Design a protein around this ligand. Sequence first.
Ligand SMILES: CCCCCCCCCCCCO[C@@H]1O[C@H](CO)[C@@H](O[C@H]2O[C@H](CO)[C@@H](O)[C@H](O)[C@H]2O)[C@H](O)[C@H]1O
Ligand SMILES: CCCCCCCCCCCCO[C@@H]1O[C@H](CO)[C@@H](O[C@H]2O[C@H](CO)[C@@H](O)[C@H](O)[C@H]2O)[C@H](O)[C@H]1O
Ligand SMILES: CCCCCCCCCCCCO[C@@H]1O[C@H](CO)[C@@H](O[C@H]2O[C@H](CO)[C@@H](O)[C@H](O)[C@H]2O)[C@H](O)[C@H]1O
Ligand SMILES: CCCCCCCCCCCCO[C@@H]1O[C@H](CO)[C@@H](O[C@H]2O[C@H](CO)[C@@H](O)[C@H](O)[C@H]2O)[C@H](O)[C@H]1O
Ligand SMILES: C/C=C(/C)[C@H](O)[C@H](C)/C=C(C)/C=C/C/C(C)=C/Cc1[nH]c(OC)c(OC)c(=O)c1C
Ligand code: SF4
Lengths: 257, 318, 83, 105, 69, 98, 156, 172, 96, 115
Amino acid sequence: YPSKETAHWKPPPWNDVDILKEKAVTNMTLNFGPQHPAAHGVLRLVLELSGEMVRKCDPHIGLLHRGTEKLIEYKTYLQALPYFDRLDYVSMMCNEQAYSIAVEKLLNIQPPPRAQWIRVLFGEITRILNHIMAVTTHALDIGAMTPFFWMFEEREKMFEFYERVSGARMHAAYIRPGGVHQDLPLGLLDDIYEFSKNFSLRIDEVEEMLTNNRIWRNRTVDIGVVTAEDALNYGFSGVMLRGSGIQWDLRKTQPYD
Amino acid sequence: MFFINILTLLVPILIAMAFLTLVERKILGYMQLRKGPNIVGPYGILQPFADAMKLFMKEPMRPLTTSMSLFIIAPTLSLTLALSLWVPLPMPHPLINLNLGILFILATSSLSVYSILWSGWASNSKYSLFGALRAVAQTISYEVTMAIILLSVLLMNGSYSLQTLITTQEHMWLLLPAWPMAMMWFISTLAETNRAPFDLTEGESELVSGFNVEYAAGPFALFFMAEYTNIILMNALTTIIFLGPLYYINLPELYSTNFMMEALLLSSTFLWIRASYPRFRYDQLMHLLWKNFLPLTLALCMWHISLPIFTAGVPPYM
Amino acid sequence: AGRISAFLKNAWAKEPVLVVSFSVWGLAIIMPMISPYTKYASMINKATPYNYPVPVRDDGNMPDVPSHPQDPLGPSLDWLKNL
Amino acid sequence: PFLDIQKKLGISLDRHFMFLSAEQPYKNAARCHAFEKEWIECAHGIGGTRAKKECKIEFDDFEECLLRYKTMRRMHDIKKQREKLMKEGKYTPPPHHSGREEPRP
Amino acid sequence: MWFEILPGLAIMGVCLVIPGVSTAYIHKFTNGGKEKRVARVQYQWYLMERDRRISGVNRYYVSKGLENI
Amino acid sequence: MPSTFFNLTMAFSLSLLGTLMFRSHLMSTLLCLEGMVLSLFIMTSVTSLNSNSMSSMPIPITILVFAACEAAVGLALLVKVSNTYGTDYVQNLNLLQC
Amino acid sequence: SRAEYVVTKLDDLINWARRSSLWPMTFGLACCAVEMMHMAAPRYDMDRFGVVFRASPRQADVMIVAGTLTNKMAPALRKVYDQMPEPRYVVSMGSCANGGGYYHYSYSVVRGCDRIVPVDIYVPGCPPTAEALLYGILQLQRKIKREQKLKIWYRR
Amino acid sequence: MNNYIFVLSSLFLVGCLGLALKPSPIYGGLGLIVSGFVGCLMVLGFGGSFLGLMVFLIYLGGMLVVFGYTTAMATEEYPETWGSNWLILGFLVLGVIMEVFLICVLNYYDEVGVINLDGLGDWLMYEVDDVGVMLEGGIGVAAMYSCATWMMVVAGWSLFAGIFIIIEITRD
Amino acid sequence: RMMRWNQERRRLLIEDLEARIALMPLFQAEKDRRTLQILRENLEEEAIIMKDVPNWKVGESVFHTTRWVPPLIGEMYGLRTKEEMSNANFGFTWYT
Amino acid sequence: MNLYTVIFINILLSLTLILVAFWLPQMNLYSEKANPYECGFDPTSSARLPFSMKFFLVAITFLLFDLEIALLLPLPWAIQTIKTSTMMIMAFILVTILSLGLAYEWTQKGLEWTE
Ligand SMILES: CCCCCCCCCCCCO[C@@H]1O[C@H](CO)[C@@H](O[C@H]2O[C@H](CO)[C@@H](O)[C@H](O)[C@H]2O)[C@H](O)[C@H]1O
Ligand SMILES: CCCCCCCCCCCCO[C@@H]1O[C@H](CO)[C@@H](O[C@H]2O[C@H](CO)[C@@H](O)[C@H](O)[C@H]2O)[C@H](O)[C@H]1O
Ligand SMILES: CCCCCCCCCCCCO[C@@H]1O[C@H](CO)[C@@H](O[C@H]2O[C@H](CO)[C@@H](O)[C@H](O)[C@H]2O)[C@H](O)[C@H]1O
Ligand SMILES: CCCCCCCCCCCCO[C@@H]1O[C@H](CO)[C@@H](O[C@H]2O[C@H](CO)[C@@H](O)[C@H](O)[C@H]2O)[C@H](O)[C@H]1O
Ligand SMILES: C/C=C(/C)[C@H](O)[C@H](C)/C=C(C)/C=C/C/C(C)=C/Cc1[nH]c(OC)c(OC)c(=O)c1C
Ligand code: SF4
């Protein structure tokens, strides 16, 4: 029997499944950085979160954009060299080499035989420098802080080789188009050798703490899996390629020096 | 004369709590190939007092979005329950003698989780709310096993009185007939006290500082005093339960000295553990406790129910 | 009978927590059945005297109820002293 | 019950702890065990309607032991009459009521 | 070196022994040179109350032996 | 004892008023159903202790046992109400008038 | 006077506690922050001076600006500085922070962190060696040692 | 100390008054902890011990879960507190006035029956076996394993079934 | 070793309980006398206090039965100082 | 009484340190200092919005297991009974159905957090 007040009632659905106006899906939007012990300085990682599950990652970079490529245009090819120290400022002499090989190609000149061995020597010291920073600060974020202090004593010693050739612990400005700036001081290869004979024990101690640890494996195994074909299509390189099985290394495939 | 007896409990504990902060920073130091504090006083002995004084002259924070009643209550509760956990501990004679001391320890410990929850919720900040909801997750993880582990050990003891554990361990540590429960008990205490590799509520790496990110100054100092008091207590409790110190009715001084040596040693292993391992993921903390410890704890509960029955080894009621 | 050994070795390798949990669970249900001491658990609990043993009026037909506690009659706890 | 199964099977699932005078652990009587045991034996077999009138003496005594309404009333009257006398000044309690007895034993 | 940790570890040690020793002695000092009577069950509490009543000074720890009968 | 039961019984009435007088959240009405369990448990516990009836002390525990199950089943339903409308407001649960 | 003397020694007391507990904010921008990690490394062990890195600006005393401050990051640096409870100190470390450094003429760089926050100590270098930063940190403790807040309150 | 139990039951009453006004479930869970704690102290005053600590233990784990559910399902932008709304603040104050009135009134028309303010404390413990040994509430609660084993069957089954019940209720 | 030490503790408890049993007759004799005097001493004061109250029967019971009903604590310490009453209600439970 | 005294003493210390912390320091309040913290940028939304609980099923399963602790805690008194066979059989079954309940939830992906 219709009554004025129930004049708006509708018959129920034929299967009790009531259509509902689509519910608002809202995730928690969180700023992760810049000032955050894990952001590596200047990452404003804006995360959309459901609980603690990450729905979207929106890296906001540019908090350390300093116009290096425009500044380079007002410099000579030598004045511009120190900008490359401050790009990957953990891999200084490797950056200088990349810039040095470019200009040498354009100049059509060749660095001499000894300076190519100095540049590969310091090219690999810098890799050990870079991998210590990568490995231990990566372990530091996960929560293992001791390996960081063990290996940054080894970095303090490699900084001594940088200073004994260039006079600066980090920004050496030592690899230059055409060769290296100064020759090795006498007695430097002994110290590099003395360090190198002992360094594999240092790697062993770090590995004893991480490689077979079940709390390290659980935090890292099956995490951030990237397939080979997506590695290539995303522009990845280096370990991000060789971690996924791809056999590529420019030192092997397009060798320099 | 009872008030003087509070002084000789709450003051030595608070002094011992402070130096635990110094011992932590120096043991972590030498384990990391450095020296830790050693300038502020002879070998840093004054460093704890500097940090305390500085924190109580630091401006305290009253964030505009904060719920002040619970914001203030939470640190006050934290330090109260840390000190209150101590009054029943027999060393070898307790300040307050309770028949169900073990339950008083269980119940007081649980209620202290609400200082993490209320502070985090009252901060009205995203990182402090993440920290609080890890306190909830961490408690749901370790609570069920921790109580059952105590039940298993107390079926060899006969009661919930802590002072009766002294008499149970007159000829042998409970560590021997119970080392599987001690292993599971020990890991629970690291989870109970938010200690690495279980510092998930704080977890500076992922959350900037977790539940106490909006706390500065003296209110933040109270949270830490509570955290480090609990470390000593949980290891002091583990020393009574499992590593029963020597007790001679004629030499009560012997029990305290031996009790201290083992409590210091166990407290060091907390600092040793913090320097050695990476941090768990708080979802994996639940899986550790529910899929490993809990199946073992239920079996050991059933083992220790039957064990006094088929050896005629039922403990006495008194 | 042959596949089970393969399974048990497999579980024992990769799931010792559960293999230990089932064993201890099942070992706790057997041990009371076979121990030659399970019977004393009741006896010792019955031999613990909490309430006062209220004496009974000696009518005269009680030839196996002691008069004095140091009589040679009545329940004895020698089995408990020498247990 | 509505299906006296327990009575039929002769078991006792919950019939044995129905009231105060039931068996207690370690033979510890309940408060007012004597009175209740009397009331339940008075009203046994005569039915509920007869028992409501013919066991009123047993019940009103059990009800008084359990709830003690008259006892509190009576001790309220003694203390209130003594309050009145002491305000006027016609009664000073004995030494053994003011905290100065010679204790027994 | 590592033994420079000891100065703080030794302070912490002395601090953790004051609670146990001070409580044991304070109990003897407030209970006539005897351990503070423990009362877990009602029976033991009754014995203390009886001892308090027959002492003569309203203190349970003033024992009276065969001197008193 | 007399004064305690009156205060305990009035405590139960206040929670029955709280349960019967809804506001927005369904979770708040669930907490009043726990205010009632707590009042009943404390009454039963005091009754049994006062009368020295040890054989009745199992019963207060079962009340807690059968009160948790409701709290669990109540919270499980509150999850399904939230998964539908995104809140636990009672005013949303009104489709069944028709 | 006696009170003026007592105020002086109370001033040394509060200063000493702030000198002996400087908690820098975990916060570095570019390559200068690598040398700040070396100062925490074993050889220098700033922890032995009572210097502990704390992530939250509420729990931090000192903000060390260790790298380039770009315009995009300038408001955020100020915000975490505002949220530092007082007393609070800034160490500007490196040419970038000191005055822009190698990027002084860039359109996107703040020409010195001292346009954004008040700076207590300037540490030169690109980067300063960990000892240079350590000398600067220890030069901040001497600045605190010269603090005279309580005495000045007395003469108000 | 003669008013001790009366005060605990008065605090318990308020905790349920605050709870009945239903502010944000963050505070409703705070009232249950304080009422749970107050109520625990009452069972202790009357001679209990195991029953006192259990209801306190159980309600500590219940409000932990309830807190997790509030932040996920029962939270709005401006959570209500007892002072948040003038109307609720009125009935919390007024509610306390009424009890001060009901107690005073009902105490006037009977003097002994319900509230006997004149005799608070005189009637807390009625009897007590002064030379007893076996009297803890734990012994009474432990009877579930021997005498009232039926209590434990239904209790165990209640919890056992509940796991199956909730897994189906929450299933996707 | 736990087994052998718990069995020894069971014998020790039996010895300690048998000591109590050997003494309960003396406590029971004393409890009766102590309780009877306290009830007699309230009766000697009700007679004094409530002489001049109409329709008051001093010592009147509240029970139809003439069986001995043990007194409550409130009946027994009700005319004494509140300290005695607080002791009987909380003496055991608050001792710690 | 002692246990009440020692805890007020604990509370008064926690209160006393709270008062000194607020009335001793020199405080300088302004809006930008007292805003919430979020790594240097403004929050994009209040922190009071719903926060999905991915372990909710385990949360309510904690309640059911929490009350099953309340049933096992009387055991220390229960092993004092004459009816040892009964006490033990009831204990074994109780722990076994808790285990059977746990196994069912484990196999139903109930311990897994919802994605
Ligand atoms: C009288 C003093 C004695 C104590 C009184 C309090 C007893 C406890 C009562 C608990 C219930 C409160 O009763 C309350 O009723 C009001 C209407 O009045 C309803 O509340 C609803 O309307 C009111 C009035 O606009 C709004 O403020 C409220 O937000 C809304 O939910 C709820 O149903 C219930 O929250
Ligand atoms: C959360 C809020 C809690 C506040 C609760 C209220 C606390 C105060 C308790 C009020 C209860 C009655 O408190 C007090 O009780 C005593 C006895 O117990 C009453 O009675 C007292 O005085 C009367 C005379 O009037 C005498 O018989 C005797 O001295 C005593 O019985 C007092 O008149 C009353 O002041
Ligand atoms: C189909 C659904 C139901 C199936 C599941 C339930 C099966 C029943 C299991 C519970 C069994 C309880 O079993 C019952 O235990 C009680 C006491 O515990 C015994 O009852 C006993 O109680 C006390 C023991 O002190 C004695 O005073 C009493 O005289 C005696 O009968 C019963 O004789 C027994 O039948
Ligand atoms: C649905 C869940 C089911 C899974 C759980 C099944 C648990 C079953 C456990 C069965 C074990 C019972 O084990 C049984 O223990 C009792 C007492 O403890 C022993 O009984 C023996 O000891 C008792 C006292 O202790 C003596 O009074 C008795 O005369 C004697 O037989 C039995 O000889 C043994 O068989
Ligand atoms: C945990 C506590 C401690 C005391 C630790 O020992 C040390 C001292 C703190 C560390 C590691 C960082 C301190 C400040 C910070 C946020 C630096 C920026 C940064 N951090 C990097 O990695 C971590 C980088 O990696 C390539 C960077 O480029 C940059 C620019
Ligand atoms: S000053 Fe030099 S080392 Fe420091 S951040 Fe700038 S470029 Fe890097």
